[PDB]
Amino acid sequence: RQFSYLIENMARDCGEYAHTRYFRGGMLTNARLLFGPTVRLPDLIIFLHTLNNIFEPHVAVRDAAKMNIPTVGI
């Protein structure tokens, strides 16, 4: 949360997207229902923080591998 503001601004500055909020189950593995059938998922996910707030791996790390999305992580 400390860096949530900074990351969101950079994404807008570089014409890219961000998700620093609570990850609702299904963003990636169920995008068709949530967004629509013709939705286009990310081609690259950059993890600035791979852990969540209870010191466990972010769910998107595992969900991005299921959707064959390459991940970059610190």
Binding site: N53, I54, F55, E56, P57
Partner: protein
Amino acid sequence: ATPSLRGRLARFGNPRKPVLKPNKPLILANRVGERRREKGEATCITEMSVMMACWKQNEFRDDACRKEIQGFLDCAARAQEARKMRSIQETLGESGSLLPNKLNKLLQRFPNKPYLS
């Protein structure tokens, strides 16, 4: 200093007989128990014993035991307010230890991990 746990439970490396036989695994939980209810202390009992002792001598007349009755009456009024003040104030008022509901919101932010991830 928390007591040791080396060579206490029955295991394969431990050659000696077990010292402890816990029925529940010794693993901290992610919550604490809810505070129990207190039995409470009866009030105005000393004023209530000298007022019922005067009736016996005065054959249960309320004209000679007036002073005793006031003690038993005024006390009841004071005790009544204290019970009302204590109930609301303790929960709303923050003194010393926290309440289970507020302490379990803090233990769920730093849960105990007995597994690997």
